[PDB]
Design an enzyme around this catalytic site. Structure first.
Site, short mmCIF file in Angstrom:
data_model
loop_
_atom_site.label_atom_id
_atom_site.label_comp_id
_atom_site.label_asym_id
_atom_site.label_seq_id
_atom_site.Cartn_x
_atom_site.Cartn_y
_atom_site.Cartn_z
N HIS A 19 0.78 -1.23 0.00
CA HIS A 19 0.00 0.00 0.00
C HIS A 19 0.82 1.28 0.00
O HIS A 19 0.39 2.32 0.53
CB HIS A 19 -1.03 -0.05 1.13
N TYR A 47 18.33 -7.13 -6.58
CA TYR A 47 18.41 -8.49 -7.20
C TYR A 47 19.85 -8.96 -7.40
O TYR A 47 20.14 -10.16 -7.25
CB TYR A 47 17.61 -8.58 -8.52
N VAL A 125 9.85 -13.82 -0.67
CA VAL A 125 9.29 -12.48 -0.83
C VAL A 125 9.47 -11.96 -2.26
O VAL A 125 8.51 -11.43 -2.84
CB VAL A 125 9.86 -11.49 0.23
N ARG A 126 10.67 -12.13 -2.83
CA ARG A 126 10.94 -11.63 -4.18
C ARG A 126 10.36 -12.55 -5.25
O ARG A 126 9.40 -12.17 -5.93
CB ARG A 126 12.42 -11.26 -4.41
N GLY A 129 6.58 -13.74 -4.97
CA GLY A 129 5.90 -12.49 -5.31
C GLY A 129 5.90 -12.18 -6.80
O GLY A 129 4.84 -11.83 -7.35
N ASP A 130 7.06 -12.29 -7.44
CA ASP A 130 7.21 -12.03 -8.88
C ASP A 130 6.38 -13.02 -9.68
O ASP A 130 5.69 -12.63 -10.62
CB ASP A 130 8.67 -12.16 -9.35
N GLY A 134 3.63 -10.47 -11.09
CA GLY A 134 4.38 -9.69 -12.09
C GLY A 134 3.60 -9.26 -13.32
O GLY A 134 3.80 -8.13 -13.81
#
Ligand code: NA
EC number: 1.14.14.18
Length: 209
Positions: A19, A47, A125-126, A129-130, A134
């Site tokens: 948010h 990354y 998390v990365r 999530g992606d 994405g």
């Protein structure tokens, strides 16, 4: 199992991370391709660090099947940035925001300590999530800012033919990791910290917009 516990444990920090004003404005079309580019430049920095940490933990033989090199994003991002910026100039120009410094520092600490549990938290998390979200961001960058689909390579995983199956098998790999109570608690705490770093990345990007 772990996949469910991760979602529950991280709920508050994750909700806050989704948010940010920066992402709200970006997704509603209130910014521009420049701001999208700044986001990708900061992402290339973290990354790059994340993937050095993944390489170390993979080499130690921890969570090997989870740490699929096909997920690697740094080189893909570089190619996107080349197109977005129109030259290789960005490599000499770009520098980490204060949140990214902190995020990279933590990732470098995980690398040097070869901290498997903490690395898996960051990987979740990365990359999960992606994998999960994405294509929403990609569609929005085309709709709002006319971004060339060839410059959205970050949001496509070439190595992955069955995305739904991959995400399921990813969660199952999490569920099947052998972890002591100490390691599991370390991982869960790390996952919240990772969402926090990411929130702060967006906070920095939104300054003076
Ligand atoms: Na799925």
């Amino acid at each position: 199992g772990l996949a469910v516990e991760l979602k529950q444990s991280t709920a508050q920090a994750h909700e806050k991370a989704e948010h940010s004003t920066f992402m709200s404005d970006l997704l509603k079309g209130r910014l521009g391709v420049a701001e999208f580019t700044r986001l990708q430049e900061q992402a290339w920095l973290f990354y790059t660090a994340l993937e050095q940490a993944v390489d170390a933990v993979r080499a130690s033989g921890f969570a090997e099947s989870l740490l699929d090199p096909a997920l690697n994003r740094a080189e893909v991002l570089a190619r996107d940035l080349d197109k977005l910026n129109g030259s290789s100039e960005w490599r000499s120009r770009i520098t980490a925001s204060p949140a990214v410094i902190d995020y990279v520092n933590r990732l470098e600490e995980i690398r040097d300590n070869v901290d498997g549990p903490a690395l898996v938290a960051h990987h979740y998390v990365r990359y999960l999530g992606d994998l999960s979200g994405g294509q929403v961001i990609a569609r929005m960058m085309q709709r709002h800012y006319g971004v060339d689909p060839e410059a959205l390579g970050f949001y496509h995983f070439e190595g992955i033919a069955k995305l739904k199956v991959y995400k399921d098998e990813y969660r199952e790999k999490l569920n099947n990791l052998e972890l002591s109570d100490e390691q599991r608690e370390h991982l869960l705490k790390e996952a919240t910290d990772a969402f926090v770093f990411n929130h702060q990345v967006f906070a920095d990007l939104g300054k003076g917009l």
